[PDB]
């Protein structure tokens, strides 16, 4: 297995491993190379750029699954203040093969 750095974040992945990640420039079926921080083959533990810049994670994208819908407002107190809004982060699903 390996730890991949993507979206400013680190995810634990494996060959054939579906994981929800941040939105990036992709379509429906494209191997996007992503850098890693640590590669673990079960005993060997890597550390340096000699390996980190040597291998990567090439996974395809099957769709763009949306995230959870957040309904929110801010309410302070006796002042009278209700700041209503929403948010739903657009994500995309990555099927790890490399």
């Amino acid at each position: 297995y390996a730890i991949v750095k993507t979206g400013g974040k680190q995810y634990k992945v494996a060959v054939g491993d579906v994981v929800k990640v941040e939105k990036l420039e992709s379509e429906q079926g494209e191997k996007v190379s992503l850098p890693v921080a640590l590669v673990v083959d079960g005993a060997t533990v890597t550390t340096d750029a000699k390996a980190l810049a040597k291998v990567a994670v090439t996974g395809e994208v099957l769709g763009h699954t949306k995230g959870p819908k957040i309904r929110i407002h801010k309410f302070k107190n006796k002042t009278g203040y209700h700041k209503r809004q929403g948010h739903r982060q657009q994500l995309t699903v990555l099927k790890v093969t490399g």
């Binding site: 995810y11 005993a43 340096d48 309410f75």
Partner: protein
């Protein structure tokens, strides 16, 4: 033109109650009582997502400490060493490794131990 404003009231009224299900007593039955609780509930969620982030950091750190002390090293020196080595690895996945693969964790400890300079002098 009398408009009979009920419909406009009923929209948000039922919209709130069906989301209010789960509260106790009148908090899940009455509009004007449910409305208030949702104000505080959502402020709580607003701050608690941020707290959730920090709390998960703390749990991950604590578990890292446990593994490190089992490997006869403290958190302070562990992280310092990882910085000197250049291991830009998060605490989340570091803890996951600390559980599912203690051996690789120990290997990272040996890396950090090697990376530490010598002592408390500079």
């Amino acid at each position: 033109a009398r408009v009979k404003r009920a419909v406009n009231a009923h929209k948000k009224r039922r919209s709130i109650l069906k989301a209010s299900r789960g509260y106790r007593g009148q908090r899940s039955r009455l509009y004007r009582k449910a409305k208030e609780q949702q104000l505080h509930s959502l402020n709580y969620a607003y701050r608690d997502r941020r707290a959730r982030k920090g709390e998960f950091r703390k749990l991950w750190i604590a578990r890292i400490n446990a593994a490190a002390r089992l490997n006869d090293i403290t958190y302070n020196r562990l992280i310092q060493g990882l910085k000197a080595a250049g291991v830009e690895v998060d605490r989340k996945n570091l803890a996951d490794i600390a559980i599912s693969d203690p051996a690789a964790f120990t290997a990272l400890v040996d890396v950090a131990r090697a990376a530490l300079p010598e002592d408390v002098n500079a």
